[PDB]
Design a protein around this ligand. Structure first.
Ligand code: CLA
Ligand code: CLA
Ligand code: CLA
Ligand code: CLA
Ligand code: CLA
Ligand code: CLA
Ligand code: CLA
Ligand code: CLA
Ligand SMILES: CC(/C=C/C=C(C)/C=C/[C@@]12O[C@]1(C)C[C@@H](O)CC2(C)C)=C\C=C\C=C(C)\C=C\C=C(C)\C=C\[C@@]12O[C@]1(C)C[C@@H](O)CC2(C)C
Ligand SMILES: CC(/C=C/C=C(C)/C=C/[C@@]12O[C@]1(C)C[C@@H](O)CC2(C)C)=C\C=C\C=C(C)\C=C\C=C(C)\C=C\[C@@]12O[C@]1(C)C[C@@H](O)CC2(C)C
Lengths: 204, 222, 192, 81
């Protein structure tokens, strides 16, 4: 039917053919129970989108810092720099603003098509019909995610794949700076210099 | 039809399975209805078991909670002390609270009397605590037919056990956890005497070197 | 309505003041217990609304706070000013056993009234300005319950951020927040 | 201490007593001794998972008597040698 993670195999029954990025990769059957599949697809959507943003703040800064256009600190040292606010205050402000946005999304997931109206002004509405893809003039200012179902799967598939790669990259940076005690981009430009003696094994 | 631990022909005559934790374990025949009396009778022993077990659940999860929470480091370390050093036994250890432990004991006796006497009067005369005026909330403390399970708006405010099957399974789970907590408190006491350190310290000592940290190596007291 | 879209519980409809469907647990399932809890809510809310101005006005004039006196406090009457320059009759006693002797009276003459709606909204003798004898009574009850809930939350604050900074002004805390909006917040007690 | 003579004596005594009680070589709850020291069968009323009929009370009795005999032997061998 479709190219799966393994060339010779049979896709799990629950992952029939529908969701974007569907490749029948579920060895552990972590979405076999009915109803859990909807939760997981939303969960992966959230992580990947966060990871995309998190990778652009871990590599692009260091990308245009090592060559030098910004002079920003490293990703793993930005947690101590003094900013106009306080680190603790910034944490709490995030927590409440995150609470509002996360809570609005949670209500959408639990009851689809119930949080589609602006509270302050009950005239502005959010254009969205698929859970996890809410449009409107804020999230979708260009109308690039509405129309034929065919293009929806393409762009959605493009979205998740870049996201899956992004999640993997950020996991690297985390562990991969933890043991090497050096920046990610520095590792890249040290791996293309002497590739055969700059490997995971030679870092213990 | 059920698991039998150390049942007998005599015990199985009156232990049939109605009670939640009923497994026929009555080697001493203490719940024989033929010679029912004051406190040794079928109506009181399950109730006493449930109450001892509930207080033991509070004890086993309370005699070790401050020590664990101080080990993980979120309560002050001076409050992270073994249970026997919290003023319950002043000789082994004492702590200075807002009131001296005898004033605290008198306050505890007053409050626990107001609660325990009402529980007793509901056991002996069911429904008698929902008639006389009691600060206007005597209607919450009415109870049900079973003394051990009032299940009122206060004692059951999340409303578990809507159906009878889940209710009975939850009863069995309560009885099992209570028996475990009772045995755990007995272990707390004996280990406090034989070791001199808190239960979590004993657990960590056993987890460190199991073969040189056990009852056999540690009945040297110190 | 506390959560948009969340279905209303079958026993919490938009009839009585409030009724925003906020009952995650379900403590008010029984109609009579719900009726009693409503009255408990109004009593708590009215007490909180009375209390908060008594903690906001005094300090604003620079006379201390609600931490100024609850035990072993100003013996010469009320501090030395405003409430009458040591005018008050109960001058020396600070733990003053005349306040927990008349609130008992107000209780005792309060408890023992039929007609729950009149148990909660007496009217008549307790309506000097006759605002209840109007057509906007339901709106007024809603406004009262709303600032009542707000006062309850505000006094919960008062308590917690009196126990978090022993000795301070619960409104000079607003001064501290305004002097350093983004630098000093609750984070001090949440994250050091 | 595991290889000590005291440990060996105590283990042997307890094991021998348990073996005698379990395999009908000593009186038990279901094995009564008459005046002629002959073992007859009785219904003690205690149900046990042991196919032969060894009960928890039988185990406790045999272990207690084995410990008694082992302590006697250990102290006697210490006092004599
Ligand atoms: C937390 C992130 C996350 C989550 C929730 C999911 C969830 C999902 N993925 Mg995605 N995926 C992810 C990360 C994630 N994936 C990453 C990083 C990759 C690249 C390696 C992929 C690659 C991928 C493919 C190629 C496919 C999926 C598919 C699926 C679905 C079935 C599997 C399942 O139930 O997962 C449940 C997962 C969990 C409960 C997470 C447990 C994580 C463990 C506990 C720790 C892992 C540690 C790690 C090794 C370091 C489900 C919607 C399949 C599908 O049809 O979806 C439409 C599919 O074809 N995913
Ligand atoms: C987009 C994925 C990605 C890419 C392109 C790289 C690229 C690189 N990594 Mg990183 N890494 C990644 C993911 C990635 N990693 C993840 C997910 C982990 C966690 C398991 C690590 C953990 C890690 C460590 C601990 C080290 C590297 C190192 C390296 C360099 C040499 C390759 C090597 O020996 O490690 C390959 C290791 C792998 C686990 C392979 C994962 C690849 C798949 C596609 C994911 C190179 C710059 C080394 C370095 O700094 O040398 C300069 C080094 O010491 N990586
Ligand atoms: C407050 C203690 C207490 C009480 C009142 C009861 C009461 C009851 N149990 Mg429960 N039980 C308890 C503790 C208790 N149990 C504990 C700790 C365990 C785990 C070992 C069990 C395990 C258990 C099972 C598996 C079963 C019962 C059953 C019963 C009923 C049969 C009558 C009976 O047990 O004698 C009444 C008991 C007492 C009056 C307690 C006397 C305790 C004496 C004074 C001291 C005990 C020894 C002491 C701790 C020293 C220990 C030395 C050494 C062993 C370490 C009755 C409702 C049976 C039943 O029908 O279930 C409903 C049944 O099948 N119980
Ligand atoms: C019936 C069970 C029980 C009993 C008698 C105790 C008794 C005690 N606990 Mg323990 N505790 C228990 C269950 C119990 N706890 C459980 C289940 C937990 C887990 C949540 C804890 C967690 C715990 C911690 C973390 C600490 C104690 C501490 C204490 C001591 C003082 C606390 C107190 O009452 O003043 C304070 C109580 C109040 C102000 C409550 C009154 C009602 C207010 C006004 C509302 C006291 C010896 C403290 C201690 O040992 O100090 C030396 C301590 O730090 N307990
Ligand atoms: C809830 C039951 C429970 C549990 C989990 C433990 C666990 C432990 N005890 Mg405690 N203990 C208990 C009951 C319990 N005990 C009771 C009832 C007594 C009184 C007879 C004691 C008296 C006691 C002493 C005097 C000592 C321990 C010690 C120990 C440690 C094991 C080493 C050892 O010699 O064990 C000896 C264990 C016993 C003498 C009791 C065995 C029989 C009881 C009923 C436990 C049965 C366990 C069973 C599998 C259920 C476990 C529940 C759950 C964890 C699965 C370990 C932390 C030693 C220690 O602190 O090491 C540093 C030690 O010196 N215990
Ligand atoms: C709507 C009611 C209300 C209002 C307007 C305030 C206003 C304020 N509080 Mg208070 N507070 C309240 C309710 C309220 N509080 C309640 C209900 C609690 C208990 C959870 C607290 C517990 C609290 C603490 C512990 C602290 C504040 C602090 C503050 C100040 C700035 C940080 C903040 O907004 O706290 C946000 C609080 C919550 C979101 C809760 C500000 C003067 C801080 C301050 O400046 O004190 C000196 C501080 O440290 N508040
Ligand atoms: C001297 C040897 C000896 C001793 C001391 C015991 C002792 C015991 N056996 Mg028995 N048993 C023995 C030999 C012995 N058995 C033999 C040779 C077999 C045949 C393979 C069995 C088969 C057997 C069964 C099937 C059961 C016992 C059980 C028991 C325990 C009863 C409670 C008790 C500790 C019962 C048990 O574990 O209950 C707790 C139980 O169910 N035993
Ligand atoms: C290996 C086998 C063995 C050996 C060598 C011994 C050797 C001894 N036993 Mg031990 N004993 C054994 C097995 C053994 N016993 C067994 C199986 C038991 C049963 C559990 C006992 C129970 C036992 C007791 C209870 C006592 C001894 C005593 C003695 C001593 C005898 C001195 C005495 O008072 O006799 C001379 C005694 C008399 C002439 C009779 C006195 C008249 C009345 C009774 C007074 C001696 C060292 C005694 C001891 O230690 O004293 C120092 C003692 O009190 N034994
Ligand atoms: C969100 C995320 C990270 C984002 C990071 C952000 C936002 C923040 C960045 C920074 O904060 C730092 C770091 C430090 C600060 O100083 C600076 C900033 C810039 C502020 C990654 C997600 C990470 C998510 C990852 C890596 C997921 C891993 C999953 C894998 C690989 C395997 C699992 C499975 O295979 C099983 C077991 C069974 C299969 O059925 C299914 C699957 C799920 C596929
Ligand atoms: C109530 C109870 C424990 C209560 C504990 C409390 C309040 C602890 C309080 C504290 O920790 C905190 C909270 C805070 C600390 O800072 C201070 C203290 C004060 C230390 C234990 C009961 C504990 C009760 C126990 C252990 C009872 C065991 C009974 C058994 C085993 C009976 C067995 C039999 O009866 C059967 C089943 C069948 C019969 O036929 C045969 C036999 C064998 C007789």
């Amino acid at each position: 039917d479709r190219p799966l993670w393994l060339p010779g195999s049979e896709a799990p029954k629950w992952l029939d053919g529908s969701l974007p990025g569907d490749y029948g990769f579920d060895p552990l059957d972590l979405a076999a129970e009915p109803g859990r599949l909807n939760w997981m697809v939303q969960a992966e959507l959230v992580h990947c989108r966060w990871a995309m943003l998190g990778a652009a703040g871990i590599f692009i800064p260091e990308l245009l810092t090592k060559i030098g256009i910004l002079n920003t600190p490293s990703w793993y040292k930005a947690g101590d720099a003094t900013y106009f606010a306080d680190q603790g205050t910034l944490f709490i402000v995030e927590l409440l603003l995150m609470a509002w946005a996360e809570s609005r999304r949670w209500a959408d997931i639990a009851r689809p098509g119930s949080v589609n109206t602006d509270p302050i002004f009950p005239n502005n509405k959010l254009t969205g019909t698929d859970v996890g893809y809410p449009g409107g003039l804020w999230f979708d200012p260009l109308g690039w995610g509405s129309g034929s179902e065919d293009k929806l799967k393409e762009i959605r598939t493009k979205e998740v794949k870049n996201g899956r790669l992004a999640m993997l990259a950020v996991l690297g940076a985390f562990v991969q700076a933890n043991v090497t005690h050096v920046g990610p981009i520095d590792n890249l430009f040290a791996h293309l210099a002497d590739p055969y003696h700059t490997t995971i094994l030679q870092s213990l | 039809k059920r698991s039998l631990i150390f049942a007998s022909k005599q015990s199985l005559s009156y232990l049939d399975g109605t009670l939640p934790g009923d497994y026929g374990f009555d080697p001493l025949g203490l719940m024989d209805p033929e010679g029912a009396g004051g406190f040794i009778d079928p109506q009181w022993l399950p109730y006493a078991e449930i109450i001892n077990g509930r207080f033991a659940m509070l004890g086993a999860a309370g005699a070790i909670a401050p020590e664990v929470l101080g080990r993980i480091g979120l309560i002050p370390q001076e409050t992270a002390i073994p249970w026997f050093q919290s003023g319950v036994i002043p000789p082994v250890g004492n702590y200075s609270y807002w009131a001296d432990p005898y004033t605290l004991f008198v306050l505890e006796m007053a409050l626990m009397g107001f609660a325990e006497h009402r529980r007793a009067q509901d056991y002996y005369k069911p429904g008698s605590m929902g008639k006389q005026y009691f600060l206007g909330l005597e209607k919450f403390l009415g109870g049900s037919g079973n003394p051990a399970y009032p299940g009122g708006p206060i004692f059951n405010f999340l409303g578990f056990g809507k159906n009878e099957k889940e209710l009975q399974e939850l009863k069995v789970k309560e009885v099992k956890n209570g028996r475990l907590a009772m045995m755990a408190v007995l272990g707390y006491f004996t280990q406090a005497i034989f070791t001199g350190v808190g239960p979590f310290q004993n657990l960590l000592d056993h987890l460190a070197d199991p073969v040189h940290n056990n009852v056999l190596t540690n009945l040297k007291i110190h | 309505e506390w959560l948009p879209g969340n279905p209303r519980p079958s026993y919490l409809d938009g009839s009585a003041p409030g009724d925003f469907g906020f009952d995650p647990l379900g403590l008010g399932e029984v109609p009579e217990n719900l009726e009693r809890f409503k009255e408990s809510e109004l009593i708590h809310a009215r007490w909180a609304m009375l209390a908060v101005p008594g903690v906001l006005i005094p300090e604003a004039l620079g006379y201390g706070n609600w931490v100024s006196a609850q035990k072993w406090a100003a013996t010469p009457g009320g501090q030395a000013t405003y409430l009458g320059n040591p005018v008050p009759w109960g001058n020396l006693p600070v733990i003053l056993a005349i306040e927990f002797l008349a609130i008992a009276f107000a209780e005792s003459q309060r408890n023992g009234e039929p007609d729950p709606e009149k148990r909660k909204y007496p009217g008549g003798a307790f309506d000097p300005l006759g605002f209840s004898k109007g057509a906007n009574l339901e709106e007024l009850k809603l406004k009262e319950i709303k600032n009542g809930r707000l006062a309850l939350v505000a006094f919960l604050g008062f308590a917690v951020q009196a126990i978090a900074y022993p000795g301070t002004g619960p409104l000079e805390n607003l001064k501290t927040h305004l002097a350093d909006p983004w630098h000093n917040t609750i984070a001090h007690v949440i994250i050091p | 201490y595991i290889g000590s003579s005291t440990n060996l004596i105590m283990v042997a005594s307890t094991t021998l007593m348990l073996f005698a009680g379990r395999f009908g070589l000593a009186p038990s709850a279901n094995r009564k001794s008459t005046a002629g020291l002959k073992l007859v069968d009785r219904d003690s009323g205690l149900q046990t998972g042991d196919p032969a009929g060894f009960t928890a009370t039988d185990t406790l009795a045999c272990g207690a008597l084995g410990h008694v005999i082992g302590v006697g032997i250990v102290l006697g061998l210490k006092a004599t040698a």
